Structure 1
Amino acid sequence: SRYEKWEKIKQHYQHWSDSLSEEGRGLLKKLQIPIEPKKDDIIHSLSQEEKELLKRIQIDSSDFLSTEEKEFLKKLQIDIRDSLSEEEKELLNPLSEKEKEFLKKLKLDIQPYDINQRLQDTGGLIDSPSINLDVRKQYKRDIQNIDALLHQSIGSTLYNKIYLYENMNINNLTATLGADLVDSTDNTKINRGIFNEFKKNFKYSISSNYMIVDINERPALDNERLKWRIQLSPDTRAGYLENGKLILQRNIGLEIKDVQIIKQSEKEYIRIDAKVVPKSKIDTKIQEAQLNINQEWNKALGLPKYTKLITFNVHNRYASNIVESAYLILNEWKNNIQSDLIKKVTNYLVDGNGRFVFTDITLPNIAEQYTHQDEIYEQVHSKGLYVPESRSILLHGPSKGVELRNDSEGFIHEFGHAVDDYAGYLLDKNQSDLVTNSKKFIDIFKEEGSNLTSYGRTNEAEFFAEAFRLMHSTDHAERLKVQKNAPKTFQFINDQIKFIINS
């Protein structure tokens, strides 16, 4: 019975609920309902020129903000444009230098106080210098206090009598597969192929924030196609939340027991059955996996066995896929790029203590970035990233890059940046730079810069990287388009590759 179960669990935590302080309650409420930034105050704090700038700016054109930072700026833009005319509003590409630098500093002032979000973004590494220091300390105090509140386990009586539930948006786990998981012809069906890709490498899950689950399964909203059914362990700590819900302790492990396609009210959903395990159990599987993929690829690249090249920075709910997808990504990388170029460049990265960082936490919270990027407004979150100061490639699992078909296409783009780096280094080892800053390629970019992908138009660095990406696509047509639409760039990259190999 739904209601008896609800009552039985509520009574279990009843003394706990009654014992909560006024501070404890407010803290628990703050967690469920994050404190949003005050739009009025933000807009008021802008200058007249900055308002006009924010008013006309194409927000989606950015490539360093999060989906949530973009969503807020969109709302901020609306309030700005309100006072305008009806005809003018109807009227209202990469960003200009002026625009980009403005958004970069503006993102510092649009951060909501969201404890769960901070935990997921950092994967628990809450000391990461990706937010204001004072806010960071407020988060630490709140999280520690919440950990203290959640001291009562579910019990050895209830843990195997109850299932708890969670509806989830597919884009939470993976934006890439989420775009094509629902059948395009029939919205009520799941694409059997994509469902297989999703199901195959999903064996375990990690929660670095506090899961808020339903005691009783509620019908999914239209964006929710994932129906988690969770069984807790006896010593899993939790707390009762009003309207039949439970707040779970952070840092729990979840073994994926079964993933099925089910029908609820004449529509297909994905059932994910999970069992709570000690997180350390999962972390061991991850660490063992990292030890393995490094051994396989050190040999394959002729690197010493003790070389730490590939890093798994995994802390979130689609954990196992981040690990398993890494194999598939590097396989494609090996297939579509000549071995000598790969070895030469990888050795350069290893000589700089560089890493291949595969992660499900946001890239500003990766040490390989933030150690060389003190300024938050310069910190970038994106699908992928190359950091020359650390000689590191960063690849963010859950997200989706612009006009990419897969993660492997993203990684090759980033390897392109490393090629851009090494080649510029070989030209002048004393004063190392990027070949894309050479007068030659700058002229090539001034001419052919718009002939490839839209994103390639950003700058000479990204252009080189996009060209390099398409030159090594599995699609032969794409490789030819570069040769035909940007022949100078085509030869320029080929020259660098030869020069690198012959070095």
Structure 2
Amino acid sequence: NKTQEEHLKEIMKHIVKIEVKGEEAVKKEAAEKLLEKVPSDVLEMYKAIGGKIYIVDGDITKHISLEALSEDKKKIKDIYGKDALLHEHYVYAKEGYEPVLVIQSSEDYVENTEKALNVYYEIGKILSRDILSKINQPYQKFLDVLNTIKNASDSDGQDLLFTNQLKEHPTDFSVEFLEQNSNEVQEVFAKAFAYYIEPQHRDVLQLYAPEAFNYMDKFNEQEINLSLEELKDQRMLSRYEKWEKIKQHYQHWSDSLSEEGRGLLKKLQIPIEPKKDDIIHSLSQEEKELLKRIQIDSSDFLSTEEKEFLKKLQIDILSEKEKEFLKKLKLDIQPYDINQRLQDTGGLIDSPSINLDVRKQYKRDIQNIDALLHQSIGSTLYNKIYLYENMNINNLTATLGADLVDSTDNTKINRGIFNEFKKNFKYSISSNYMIVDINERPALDNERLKWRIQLSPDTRAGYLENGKLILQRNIGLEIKDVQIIKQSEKEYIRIDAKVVPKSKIDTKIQEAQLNINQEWNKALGLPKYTKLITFNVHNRYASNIVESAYLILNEWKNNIQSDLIKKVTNYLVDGNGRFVFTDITLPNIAEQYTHQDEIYEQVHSKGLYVPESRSILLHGPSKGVELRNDSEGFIHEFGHAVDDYAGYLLDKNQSDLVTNSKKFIDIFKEEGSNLTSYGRTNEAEFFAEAFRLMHSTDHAERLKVQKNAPKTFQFINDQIKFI
């Protein structure tokens, strides 16, 4: 316990002094103790935009740089909204193209909260009005903060951070309001910065308005360094000094290059296009006569470019046994692309879904590229490195790739689809080769996603001369923040990521797999160790494919009664069933080439039922030609599963499906011509289409099958009677 002479020692430690430095040295040291609390980043940015820090004495209107101010600008309202005059006040900041910070010096900045609070308010007003208004900030993130503040239950944040004009605004805050009232948003950001910096009021700003506290805390931790580097991006000499340091560091690996390495890098840049005479001379037989007479614009297996290439090959010289030659000649005209092979395989370059020596040439060239990419990044010439990428949305998803951008003006982002995008985009896995940039270049018209990669100390890469860099294979990326920016009046998406090893991301996916298996055995009544859901995921949009499985299976659960679910899933558990929710290509998850007969008979589409092993696939990025979302794709494949299980309940030694019986082919020729065009190809697709549309979300699509095919409705409701 403390005795009394110890209290004498504490109170003399606060009271007694030994050295007095006069006036002006303490005047100088009080000002630096004032400016020590501010992050150094905004001082460096105020240094870079052309600002001067003037610690003066006496009056502040008597300084030279504030001489030409009018009578009107000398009426200043402080942090609390009350009146002041500039010959009475002590800090003013000059606006425009040459800003000036003027601070009256005194010994009252060391202990007081008020004067230091007003100084940090003026510094925050500089930050909101000058630095951030050169990269078009504040923006939609801070508008979400503002609408969270003014739609609260309690009315203390509105009193603390808003003026009277922002109170009486009856609706919410749109981006029009940030356009034509940007100075009010600047005042609000300044006031939040002021209450966050001064360490007496930090707990008060946490208590009265917590969301502004979270915003400013995450801002002063990460976004201020990111914004300083993006402000240096607007300047050219910083770009070329970063260019200089990267070229000097990566000089010796470009000095240790051979001709074969440069040829491999250039063949990794562009696809090796196929030539046409080597295609035509390859046949020379009856095969030329099968290529010569053919319905070009009738078969639905090849794309537009591929049918045009075959139309180009007719001038270089049918749903029957000729189209197998089309399946075989689909892979024959595809360019030698390393990126497409790495993008489609998902790490298994031994997947035998293409030709033999082409697979071997792929594998040897990929091992050559990975063996040449051996140089680490860990160096002493630089601090944190910010490497960019412009990427298309269609490389991640085709479900949101069309409705991301609004239809009225194509320079906006639709906010509902943006929140659907933002909801579960937590991480990323880079299997293919990220050809990244050193500095910023503007994007192509299809590419609104503007990545920004922060590296690792163990990043392995190689250098190119034209202003690019390439990353290696199997890199883990954990997403930090996804926000809408504006650049040159075109609204975009900015995405940050942070490099992690692959084992953490696959550990997360293993944990999520075990959790979804426990939950959907618990909801279906199945054995403890059954593996019914699995994830073979390796691509960039991994997290949303992991998270969207829950919505897919719940929507399949809600659209069908529970008895058919239980019975057909019991059949699938008996037949080694899975529900592969993957985002890699369909012939490469190894539930499908372990039962097919030919390589060119492989299938790539939305959902797929493997008849021998009783599996249901799904594809992540790709969107169906018919479907509206993936949940109808899962019901669409559960249709084929019900077809197989009904084919087993006619005879346990006979045909696999109930639609191959001739007791449904008559109904398929009677009522198979009143519904959508996808099922019209043959009987099984109409079967799955009827089973998809009978269990719709809204009941009117269920009632269309009631009105158009009533006997098929009665037959399908007799096919549920198999229990």
Contact conserved, 1:294 with 1:310, CA < 8 A, in 2? yes
DSSP-derived class of the 1:320 partner:
helix
Kept in 1, the 8 Å contact 2:675–2:708? The answer is: yes
Q: Does 1:267 align with 2:504?
A: no
| 1:81-117, Cα deviation, whole Å (9 max, x unpaired) | xxxxxxxxxxxxxx73356434212213122211111
- Cα distance 1:482–1:180, how it changes in 2: closer, same or farther (>3 A)? same
Pair 1:157–1:485, CA change in 2 (3 A): farther
Q: 2:242 is paired with a residue of what secondary structure?
A: helix
* Equivalent-residue separation in structure 1 for 2:305 and 2:575 (angstroms): 34
Distance 1:399 1:337, change over 3 A: same
Match of 2:464 in 1: 241
Specify whether residues 485 and 124 from structure 1 end up closer, same or farther in structure 2 by C-alpha distance, changes over 3 A only. same
User: Counterpart of 1:345 in 2: which secondary structure?
Assistant: helix
- The answer to whether the 8 Å contact 1:115/1:143 transfers is yes
Long gaps (5+) in structure 2: 1-237
Q: Secondary structure in 2 aligned to 1:282?
A: helix
Q: Give 1:84's aligned residue.
A: none
Indicate how the Cα distance of structure 1 residues 33 and 432 shifts in structure 2: closer, same or farther if over 3 A, else same. Answer: same
Which whole-Å CA distance do the structure 2 matches of 1:280 and 1:67 have between them? Answer: 40
Take 2:476 and 2:310, find their aligned partners in 1: how far apart are those partners?
35
- Aligned equivalent of 2:289, options 52, 57, 62: 52
Q: Secondary structure at the match of 1:246?
A: strand
Does structure 1 retain, via aligned residues, the 8 Å contact 2:580–2:618?
A: yes
Q: Within 1, Cα distance between the matches of 2:241 and 2:308?
A: 40
1:206–1:317 CA contact under 8 A, matched in 2: yes
2:535 and 2:581 in contact (8 A); partners too: yes
Helix, strand or coil at the partner of 1:97: coil
In 1: Cα distance, 2:389 partner to 2:488 partner: 18
Q: In the TM superposition, what whole-angstrom CA distance separates every residue of 1:426-480 from its partner, at most 9, and x where no partner exists?
A: 1111124100101011111122223211010011111100110011111212111
Distance 1:68 1:289 in 2: 39
**Distance in 1 (alpha carbons) for counterparts of 2:568 and 2:308:** 38
TM-aligned CA deviation for residue 160 of structure 1: 4.8
Q: Tell whether the 8 Å contact from 1:64 to 1:382 is kept in structure 2 after alignment.
A: no
> Which of residues 254, 257, 262 in structure 2 aligns to 1:25?
262
Deviation at 1:379, TM superposition (A): 0.4
Q: Note if contact 1:64-1:381 (Cα within 8 Å) is conserved in structure 2.
A: no
Question: Residues 64 and 227 of structure 1: is their aligned pair in 2 closer, same or farther, counting only changes over 3 Å?
Answer: same
CA distance in 2, matches of 1:160, 1:307: 49
Q: Distance in 2 between matches of 1:60 and 1:125?
A: 35
Does the C-alpha gap of structure 1 residues 14 and 70 become closer, same or farther in structure 2, counting only changes over 3 Å?
A: farther
**Residue 167 and residue 73 in structure 1: after superposition, are their counterparts in 2 closer, same or farther (change >3 A)?**
farther
Q: Secondary structure at the match of 1:228?
A: strand
Q: Secondary structure at the match of 1:259?
A: strand
Q: Please tell me whether the aligned partners of residues 643 and 658 of structure 2 are also in contact (alpha carbons under 8 angstroms).
A: yes
**1:393·1:414 contact (CA, 8 Å) conserved in 2?**
yes
Change (3 A) 1:357 1:244: same
Instruction: Sort the Cα spacing of 1:486 and 1:228 in 2 relative to 1 into closer, same or farther, 3 A.
Output: same
In structure 2, relative to structure 1, the CA distance for the partners of 1:478 and 1:266 (3 Å cut) is: same
Superposed displacement of residue 62, structure 1: 5.7
SS in structure 2 of the partner of residue 275 of structure 1: strand
1:416/1:107 Cα in 2 relative to 1: closer, same or farther (>3 Å)? same
After alignment, is 108-117 or 246-255 more displaced? 108-117
When the two structures are superposed, what TM-score results if normalisation uses the length of structure 2?
0.64
In structure 2, the CA distance between the partners of 1:386 and 1:150, relative to structure 1 (3 Å rule), is same
Measured at CA, do residues 322 and 346 of structure 1 come closer, stay the same or move farther in structure 2, by a change above 3 Å?
Answer: same
Offset, 1:72: 5.6
- Distance, in Å, in 2 between the alignment partners of 1:254 and 1:60 is 43
CA offsets per residue over residues 137-165 of structure 1, 9 Å max, x none? 11111111111111111215478522111
1:237 deviates by: 0.3
1:66 Cα deviation from its structure 2 partner = 7.3
How far did 1:487 drift? 2.0
The answer (yes or no) to whether the contact 2:342–2:432 under 8 Å persists in 1 is: yes
Q: Secondary structure at the match of 1:353?
A: coil
Q: TM-score, with normalisation over the residues of structure 1?
A: 0.91
Q: Report the identity percentage.
A: 100
1:222 to 445, 448, 451: 445
Distance 1:56 1:6, change over 3 A: farther
The CA deviation at 1:350 is 1.0
Do residues 73 (structure 1) and 296 (structure 2) align?
A: no
Deviation at 1:305, TM superposition (A): 2.3
**Aligned-residue offset at 1:490:** 1.9
Following the alignment from structure 1 to structure 2, what is the Cα–Cα distance between the partners of residues 67 and 123?
Answer: 26
Maintained 8 Å contact 2:461/2:469: yes
Provide Cα deviations, 1:273-296, integer angstroms capped at 9, x if missing partner: 111111111111111111111110
Shift in Å, 1:41: 2.8
Distance 2:247 2:567 in 1: 62
C-alpha deviations, 1:335-387, integer Å up to 9, x for none?
Answer: 10111101100111111111100111100112111111241211001111111
Aligned length: 485
Worse-matched range after superposition: 106-115 or 135-144: 106-115
The 1:62–1:491 alpha-carbon spacing in structure 2 relative to 1, beyond 3 Å, is: farther
CA distance in 2, matches of 1:253, 1:197: 23
CA 1:158–1:195: 2 relative to 1, 3 Å: farther
In structure 2, distance between residues paired with 1:61 and 1:255: 45
- Stretch deviating more after TM superposition (17-26 or 66-75): 66-75
Q: Which moved more, 1:35-44 or 1:59-68?
A: 59-68
Structure 1 distance, partners of 2:531, 2:306, is 34
Structure 1 221/297 Cα, relative in aligned 2: closer, same or farther at 3 Å? same
Cα deviation, 1:244-267, whole Å, max 9, x if unaligned, reads: 111111000001111111112111
Decide whether aligned partners of structure 1 residues 64 and 341 sit closer, same or farther in structure 2, where only a CA change above 3 A counts: farther
Q: How far does residue 49 in structure 1 lie from its aligned partner after superposition? A: 8.8
On the 8 A contact 1:108/1:376 being kept in 2, the answer is: no
The verdict on how the C-alpha distance between 1:159 and 1:351 changes in structure 2, with shifts beyond 3 A counting, is farther
Residue 456 of structure 1: which of 676, 679, 692 is its match?
A: 679
Runs of 4+ residues deviating >6 angstroms:
47-61, 77-80
What residue is the counterpart of 1:4 in the other structure?
241
CA contact (8 A) 1:226 1:270 kept: yes
Distance in 2, matches of 1:142 and 1:460, equals 45
Distance 1:425 1:132, change over 3 A: same
- Equivalent residues of 1:252, 1:278 under 8 A apart: yes
The CA deviation at 1:18 is 1.0
Q: Is the 8 A contact 2:299 2:319 kept in 1?
A: no
**CA separation of 1:160 and 1:318: change in aligned 2, threshold 3 A:** farther
Give the greater-gyration-radius structure (CA): 2
**Are residues 320 and 71 of structure 1, via their aligned partners in 2, closer, same or farther at CA, if it must alter by over 3 Å?**
farther
Q: Choose from 107, 117, 139 the match for 2:362.
A: 139
- The answer to whether the Cα contact below 8 Å between 1:449 and 1:457 also exists between their aligned partners in 2 is yes
SS in 1 for 2:499: strand
Q: Deviations over 1:306-326 (max 9, x none)?
A: 110111010111111111111
User: Which residues of structure 1 form unaligned runs of 5+?
Assistant: 81-94
- Would the aligned equivalents of 1:290 and 1:310 in 2 still touch at CA under 8 Å? yes
For residues 56-91 of structure 1, the C-alpha deviation after alignment (integer angstroms, 9 at most, x for no partner) is 9787876655798678657657978xxxxxxxxxxx
Native 8 Å contact 1:66 1:381 kept in 2: no
Distance 1:74 1:157, change over 3 A: farther
